[PDB]
Amino acid sequence: HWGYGKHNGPEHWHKDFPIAKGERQSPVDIDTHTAKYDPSLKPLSVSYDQATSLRILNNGHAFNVEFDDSQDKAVLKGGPLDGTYRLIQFHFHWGSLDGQGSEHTVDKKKYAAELHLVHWNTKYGDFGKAVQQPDGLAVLGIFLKVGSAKPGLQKVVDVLDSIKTKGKSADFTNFDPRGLLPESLDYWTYPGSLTTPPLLECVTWIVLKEPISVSSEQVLKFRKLNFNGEGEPEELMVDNWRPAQPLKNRQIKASFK
Numbered sequence: 179h180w181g182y183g184k185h186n187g188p189e190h191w192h193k194d195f196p197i198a199k200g201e202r203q204s205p206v207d208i209d210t211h212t213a214k215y216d217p218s219l220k221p222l223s224v225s226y227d228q229a230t231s232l233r234i235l236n237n238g239h240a241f242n243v244e245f246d247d248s249q250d251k252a253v254l255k256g257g258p259l260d261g262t263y264r265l266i267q268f269h270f271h272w273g274s275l276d277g278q279g280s281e282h283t284v285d286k287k288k289y290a291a292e293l294h295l296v297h298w299n300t301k302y303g304d305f306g307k308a309v310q311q312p313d314g315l316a317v318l319g320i321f322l323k324v325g326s327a328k329p330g331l332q333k334v335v336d337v338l339d340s341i342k343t344k345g346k347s348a349d350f351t352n353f354d355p356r357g358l359l360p361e362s363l364d365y366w367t368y369p370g371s372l373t374t375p376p377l378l379e380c381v382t383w384i385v386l387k388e389p390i391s392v393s394s395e396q397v398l399k400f401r402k403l404n405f406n407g408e409g410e411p412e413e414l415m416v417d418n419w420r421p422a423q424p425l426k427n428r429q430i431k432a433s434f435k
């Protein structure tokens with residue numbers, strides 16, 4: 179079973195998921211000087227006003243806040259995207275230390291964590307079909323740095339005690355993901371992949387330039403989660419990030435000057 183340990187971590191993934199060495203793998207380092215401003219890029223449209231969260235799940239790799247994606251309730255459009263992408267879930271990747279945890283890096287800088295809001299292209303009907311398409315998903319990535327608390331994150335933090343171990347879920351309704359965004363929607367974008375197995379090359383990445391601030395106490399609570407199931411040897415859920423992969427034949431575009 180793949181994971182983030184020494185014996186099943188990112189180095190090993192290629193043996194069961196050979197696409198790990200593919201042509202459009204994620205995450206990548208974002209070289210801010212080499213990224214090119216693309217004036218043809220449109221403003222992102224994030225329309226989360228009708229979002230319906232349902233549940234939070236510890237899946238043994240991270241925790242997912244899941245949404246009702248059976249209607250156009252929370253959608254991402256514009257920017258580099260053609261069509262409409264529906265929010266299905268968000269999750270984070272984080273470190274054991276404030277100095278690491280993000281998947282994308284910015285001029286080699288690692289943030290304490292990275293939020294992924296995962297959306298699927300409605301033209302493919304559902305998430306499972308969408309991941310089989312080169313333009314199936316749009317993932318909005320947001321960096322977390324440690325400083326002031328993010329008030330909109332606290333409801334997530336406070337439920338983590340109830341999903342400590344792999345396979346635990348809890349009702350999680352009425353959560354508003356707008357509370358997790360920074361002020362600016364300036365972004366970088368490039369074609370990539372899921373950052374965990376199956377590592378499918380189905381993602382348009384949209385990574386926001388402005389990080390959000392979360393408190394040390396907030397991230398500390400992420401680090402109390404467990405990779406293991408209940409009754410198994412405990413192993414803290416930390417450093418659940420894949421390192422930057424080769425950019426290969428790709429250009430990162432910036433929405434901003």
Ligand SMILES: CCCOc1ccc(S(N)(=O)=O)cc1
Pocket residue numbers: 179180181185186187190191192193194195
């Ligand atoms: C005895 C357990 C097998 O160990 C492994 C499980 C999963 C992988 S991976 N990361 O290729 O999918 C490797 C070894």
Ligand SMILES: CCCOc1ccc(S(N)(=O)=O)cc1
Pocket residue numbers: 294296309317371372373374375376
């Ligand atoms: C196809 C089941 C796995 O779904 C996902 C795996 C990883 C991501 S990430 N970390 O790239 O946003 C999203 C969906």
Ligand SMILES: [Zn+2]
Pocket residue numbers: 269270271294373
């Ligand atoms: Zn992710």
